[PDB]
């Protein structure tokens with residue numbers, strides 16, 4: 581049973597994603613996160629190779645499963661009569677990117693470069709494994725404060741990556757691209773790159789560039805903080821109105837603003853000490 585295998589701690593958060601609790605695996609004292617999701621609230625249903633219908637997140641997290649620290653690890657999962665329980669890895673000490681930016685304001689470009697690079701490495705790993713996250717944002721990024729390593733969380737709005745159009749979306753509207761707003765249509769990679777541009781603006785400015793549909797559609801970027809010309813260029817390129825004008829992950833990582841990234845441990849030493 582789940583109740584004998586894990587010691588339940590405080591609620592870490594709840595919302596559209598369900599309810600997430602801090603926990604401890606009783607056997608080895610390993611820190612875990614216990615995620616509960618009600619069956620009636622599930623947006624994307626997946627199918628396990630053995631045939632059983634599970635939340636898409638269970639399918640997606642199994643697809644990415646490796647020694648790669650950039651994606652939160654699924655440790656175990658359970659079915660209950662009206663819900664699913666997901667046992668996830670829990671870094672300690674940890675802080676999500678949203679709380680980190682709230683406490684510190686706009687980040688130094690060196691810090692933003694290190695964090696953005698790790699998000700890109702994590703997203704590239706998902707895509708290479710046939711997984712599309714669909715809800716890339718500061719709230720879905722965990723910072724391992726000791727190691728300076730970032731992890732992607734919440735694959736509950738995700739899908740299997742495909743080359744055809746998506747007509748469904750249940751991620752964050754303010755991170756969604758203008759083709760979703762205008763037409764209820766987007767392609768995986770170019771929509772992911774748009775959300776990445778919103779994320780990078782958020783990191784260097786301390787807030788998102790757009791709040792309303794009209795602003796997303798217009799796509800005019802205003803810099804409220806001092807941001808280098810190379811960083812402003814990368815942001816505007818990710819935020820191109822025409823999806824095909826957006827850079828590939830390779831063009832992003834080869835961008836001159838992305839050069840000479842710090843190692844995660846150098847990041848923890850300089851910026852998280």
Ligand SMILES: Nc1nccnc1C(=O)Nc1cnccc1N1CCC[C@H](N)C1
Nearest residue numbers: 592593597600613668669670676719734
């Ligand atoms: N593994 C974790 N370790 C520490 C903290 N959180 C998580 C987590 O999975 N969180 C999570 C999963 N699915 C949806 C939302 C989640 N968050 C809950 C805490 C607040 C965070 N912004 C979102």
